[PDB]
Amino acid sequence: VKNSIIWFRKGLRLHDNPALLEACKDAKHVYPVFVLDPHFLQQKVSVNRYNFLLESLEDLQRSFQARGSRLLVLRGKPEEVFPRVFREWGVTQLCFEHDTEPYAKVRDAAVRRLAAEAGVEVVTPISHTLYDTDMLVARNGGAAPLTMQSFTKLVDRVGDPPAPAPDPPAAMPPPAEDMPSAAPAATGVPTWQEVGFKEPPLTVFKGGETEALARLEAAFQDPKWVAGFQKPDTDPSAWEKPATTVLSPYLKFGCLSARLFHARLLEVYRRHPAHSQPPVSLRGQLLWREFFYTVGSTTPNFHRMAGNPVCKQIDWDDNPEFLAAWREARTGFPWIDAIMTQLVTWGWMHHLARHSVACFLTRGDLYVSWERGMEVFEEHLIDQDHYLNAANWMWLSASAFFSQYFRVYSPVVFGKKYDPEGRFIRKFLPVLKDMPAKYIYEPWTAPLEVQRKAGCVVGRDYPAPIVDHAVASKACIARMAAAYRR
């Protein structure tokens, strides 16, 4: 008979899952498996992103239980667990969503050689991305595009991406009964305390497909806001209602399908003729995700500077003091320190908010390597995507794609043009709650009498600015011009 396995790595969803529909077709027993390493903390990861994964895993378990099935969370490594369950469950087909990451290509190639020895058919459909990224490189001549202007004109030449896959049946083939490896006491979704964490998460974004589909409809409640979306015109100092969709964590883990997001955008665009065009449009932002995935998958060492052909070699300085003050939110600038606080509390910031802290650390003030800043974002960001985190940090550090190093974000004026009262700063930095708005961006300029009255003395309660921007920026700007001369 047909007994299949639907492997969950990304694509933690039931909607638009071509790998799940194949594993349920003509099947007698389907096995939904998520391979979890219980020693992942003995090898860098925050409790916000990992608990976001667990909350997303409980969404699958509730969806499988409501359809007569059950999610299996197997412990160990995939190279050591799958050969055991291939013979124990009598598997003839293995389906999992395709992945284009470096570790995934080596991991999957190991699983492919194991299923061949066992006689298991491997089906790997694409659904994490809009298009087949390898197809885009072939149509473009064998090389991937390096500019958004050339990439946007390539996806328009191919046309619309494949429509989202249909929903799975309301009743799925359950796993076989009385299986030792499918025992609930060893295949249950663990909590954040049981995986080896001590402090609870503080984020306000709950993971899961049900939460992803709810935030999608909320974003589409106002179709005029969707059609007239322009990314550079959004408010980075908005936290009560974030001025963007905040769908990056659900798209990263796979709780939300990009194909369904793109299909919902065209329904609004077809009825709104004057809708925004890429790259500033909402569809353009998805094309940014497609563009970086196409370039990074074909470029070696895309997450590094050495051995990376698309990244310019820059003599980044080794300054642990500036790196520690930046990652611990004690640089003296309330606009920068509040964003880093929002990073360790929520795990998500506005794109322009990430622009200020990335510019301040790299080509702007501290001249610290973008890799050291990417590793800090890799820990706390609940939307940690290998290819976006890299191409965007190379963007803000003038290492790739971007080449206008004279544009330096002022860590004082940028936040003040959106929020002069400093509501964003008073929320994440409560030590400056009573500071007047006149000095809330430059607390060192406030008189001592104002510092005493507001309850925040610069040097005792809030640290002094580590650098003078006018002195640090001109130094970094001149060094970038000397680098580009090479």
5 binds ligand FAD (CB under 6 A): no
In 3D space, the residue among 313, 325, 367 whose CA is nearest the CA of residue 475 turns out to be 367
Query: Should residue 356 be labelled a site residue for ligand FAD when binding is judged by CB under 6 A?
Result: no
Residue with smaller CB distance to Cl ion, 257 or 410: 410
Q: Which is nearer to Cl ion, 18 or 411 (CB)?
A: 411
| Site membership for ligand FAD, residue 98 (CB under 6 A) | no
Check binding of 289 to ligand FAD (CB under 6 A).
yes
* Residue 306 in tokens: 């050495």
202/47 Cα distance (integer angstroms): 9
Residue 286 binds: one of Cl ion, ligand FAD, none (C-beta under 5 to 8 A by kind): ligand FAD
Q: Does 333 bind Cl ion (CB under 5 A)?
A: no
How far apart CA 109 and CA 369 sit, in angstroms, is 33
Indicate whether 385 belongs to the interface with ligand FAD (CB under 6 A): yes
- Which range touches ligand FAD (CB under 6 A), out of 25-33, 58-66, 246-254, 264-272? 246-254
| 72 near ligand FAD, rule: CB under 6 A | no
Task: List, as residue ranges, the binding site for FAD.
Answer: 231, 244-248, 285-292, 348, 351, 354, 383-385, 389, 392
| C-beta of residue 231 within 8 angstroms of C-beta of residue 280 | yes
Binding mask 334-353 for ligand FAD (x = CB under 6 A): -----------------x--
**Residue 361 interacts with ligand FAD (CB under 6 A)?**
no
Binding to ligand FAD by residue 46, rule CB under 6 A? no
Residue 356 makes contact with Cl ion by CB under 5 A: no
- Contacted entry of Cl ion, ligand FAD, none for residue 251, CB cut-off 5 to 8 Å set by kind: ligand FAD
Contact 276, 225 (CB under 8 A): no
User: Token digits for 251?
Assistant: 């798209």
Among ligand FAD, Cl ion, none, residue 410 binds (CB under 5-8 Å by kind): Cl ion
Indicate which single residue of 288, 316, 322, 441 sits in contact with ligand FAD (rule: CB under 6 A). Answer: 288
Which listed residue (244, 257, 356, 410) binds ligand FAD by CB under 6 A?
Answer: 244
From residue 271, alpha-carbon distances to 215, 227, 268, 293 in Å are: 22, 9, 5, 30
Determine which residue in the list 388, 398, 456, 458 makes contact with ligand FAD, applying CB under 6 A. Answer: 388
**Identified binder of ligand FAD from the candidate list 368, 383, 411, 480, rule CB under 6 A:** 383
- Show the tokens assigned to 167: 């929903």
Minimum distance from residue 405 beta carbon to Cl ion (Å): 14
Shortest distance (Å) from residue 225 CB to ligand FAD: 11
What is the Cα–Cα distance from 294 to 142, expressed in whole angstroms?
12
Residue nearest to ligand FAD (CB): 244
Q: Is 369 in the site for Cl ion (CB under 5 A)?
A: no
Number of residues that bind ligand FAD (CB under 6 A): 27
Segment interacting with Cl ion, rule: CB under 5 A, options 101-109, 237-245, 357-365, 409-417: 409-417
Q: Closest distance between Cl ion and the C-beta of residue 412, in Å?
A: 8
* Phi, psi at 347, each rounded to 5°: 85, 10
Closest CB to Cl ion: residue number: 410
Q: Which of 5, 20, 376, 381 binds ligand FAD (CB under 6 A)?
A: 381
Which span (116-124, 129-137, 183-191, 375-383) binds ligand FAD, by CB under 6 A?
Answer: 375-383
Three-state SS letters, the chain: CCEEEEECCCCCCCCCCHHHHHHHCCCCEEEEEEEECCCHHHCCCCHHHHHHHHHHHHHHHHHHHCCCCCCEEEECCHHHHHHHHHHHCCCCEEEECCCCCHHHHHHHHHHHHHHHHHCCEEECCCCCCCCCHHHHHHHCCCCCCCCHHHHHHHHHHHCCCCCCCCCCCCCCCCCCCCCCCCCCCCCCCCCCCCCCCCCCCCCCCCCCHHHHHHHHHHHCCCHHHHHCCCHHHCCCCCCCCCCCCCCHHHHHHCCCCHHHHHHHHHHHHHHCCCCCCCCCCHHHHHHHHHHHHHHHCCCCCCCCCCCCCCCCCCCCECCHHHHHHHHCCCCCCHHHHHHHHHHHHCCCCCHHHHHHHHHHHHHHCCCECHHHHHHHHHHHCCCCCHHHHHHHHHHHCCCCCCCCCCCCCCCCHHHHCCCCCCHHHHHHCHHHCCCCCCCCCCHHHCCHHHHHHHCCCECCCECCCCCCHHHHHHHHHHHHHHHHHC
Residue 394 interacts with ligand FAD (CB under 6 A)? no
- Interacting span for ligand FAD (CB under 6 A) from 16-24, 61-69, 282-290, 333-341: 282-290
Tell me if the bond preceding 279 is cis, omega within 30° of 0: yes
Applying CB under 6 A, does 397 fall inside the site for ligand FAD?
no
Given candidates 414, 428, 441, 462, which one binds Cl ion under the rule CB under 5 A?
414
State how far Cα 142 lies from the chain centre: 28
Question: Pick from 31, 64, 322, 393: which binds ligand FAD (CB under 6 A)?
Answer: 393
292-321 footprint of ligand FAD as x/- string (CB under 6 A) = x-----------------------------
Nearer to Cl ion, 116 or 413 (CB): 413
Residues that bind Cl ion (CB under 5 A): 409-410, 413-414
The residue ranges that bind ligand FAD (CB under 6 A) are 231, 244-248, 251-252, 285-286, 288-289, 292, 351, 354-355, 358, 377, 381, 383-385, 388-389, 392-393, 396
